[PDB]
């Protein structure tokens, strides 16, 4: 959950 939440917000 941490590295999807945040990597889903770094690849926009």
Do not use: Q, V
């Not at 959950?1 to 926009?12: A, D, Q, R, V, Y």
């Amino acid at each position: 959950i941490l590295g999807t939440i945040l990597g889903l917000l770094k690849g926009l």
